[PDB]
From a paper:
The structure is well ordered, with the entire main-chain of each monomer visible in the 2mFo-DFc electron density map, revealing a β-trefoil fold consisting of three related sub-domains. MytiLec is somewhat unusual in binding ligand at each subdomain, and it forms a dimer in solution, giving a total of six ligand sites per protein.
Two monomers of MytiLec are found in the asymmetric unit, and the model shows expected geometrical features and has no Ramachandran outliers. The two monomers in the asymmetric unit are closely associated by hydrophobic interactions and hydrogen bonds, as shown in Supplementary Tables S1 and S2. PISA18 reports the buried interface area between MytiLec monomers to be about 740 Å2 per chain. Two adjacent phenylalanine residues, Phe 93 and Phe 94, sit opposite their symmetry mates at the dimer interface. MytiLec was originally reported to be a monomer in solution on the basis of gel filtration but analytical ultracentrifugation confirms the protein is a tightly-bound dimer, and mutation of Phe 93 and Phe 94 blocks dimerisation. In order to observe any changes in the protein on ligand binding, both the apo and GalNAc complex structures were determined. Both the apo crystal and the co-crystal with ligand were cryo-protected immediately prior to flash-cooling by soaking in mother liquor containing 25% glycerol.
Residue numbers in the entry:
A (entry chain B): -3 to 149
B (entry chain A): -1 to 149
The structure:
């Protein structure tokens, strides 16, 4: 809904964060989502709850949301994650704050491309069905990157 | 308009109730499993700290406690309703793994661990994880529709 938490999406193994590539306040449609160590307001996210666990991962600065590129119902492994303005069911994710992962409605997870525990800055993110330590994410305060915050509001 | 929901034992389809089904259960009333549905078995969840909060009997405002209110209760500790609020009554509603976890790490179980507990079976804390300790949180008007308990 319109009341949302504002948080950082932190890759647990590396300590890096989800960013729009380039860090714009208003990324173009289909801008890749990457991992990067910087912290600033143009990498803050919100979670827009739609249907129980399901909702949109919203870029706070622009209002664009996370999508598997191309808007397929069941994206294959290695489908890149991007930002896009469209709001529809194929952009639904759940923020699993118990198992520490981000799961798409068709069942794959958000990963760093290549699956490293310690990826470099600018590493792309993709959908992949595998579960392992390098696909874990926690959701933390913009003012304290170690403090978990509740994203279901 | 806080979330109001049924706590459904996944394996059996029975629900969490105050023993006796009252709108006004006394302090230390046991929490049981039972198949009946009514407004006196609706629950709410009051968030305290991120994942942690109080599981609340909607009709009375009583919350779930380990009997005796200890921080780190042993296996088989009965679960009861009580009006007091304190940090030993904190639980998280894990709607991903489908369980209810206390702050010290044990889970809500049917006493005995059955996949098909009879009506009136007591609930307890126990550290084990298995299919008969799974619970889902559903709409009073549609017991198959999961609802978000955090809002």
């Amino acid at each position: 809904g319109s009341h949302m938490a504002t948080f950082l999406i932190k890759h647990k193994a590396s300590g890096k964060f989800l960013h729009p590539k380039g860090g714009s306040s208003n990324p173009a449609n289909d801008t890749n989502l990457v991992l990067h160590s910087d912290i600033h307001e143009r990498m803050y996210f919100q979670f827009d709850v739609v249907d129980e666990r399901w909702g949109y991962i919203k870029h706070a600065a622009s209002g664009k949301i996370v999508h598997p590129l191309g808007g397929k119902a069941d994206p294959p492994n290695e489908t890149k994650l991007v930002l896009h303005q469209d709001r529809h069911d194929r952009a639904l994710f759940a923020m699993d704050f118990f198992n520490d992962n981000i799961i798409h409605k068709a069942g794959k997870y958000v990963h760093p491309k290549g699956g490293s525990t310690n990826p470099p800055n600018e590493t792309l993110t993709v959908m992949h069905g595998d579960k392992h330590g390098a696909m874990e994410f926690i959701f933390v305060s913009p003012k304290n990157k170690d403090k978990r915050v509740l994203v279901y509001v």
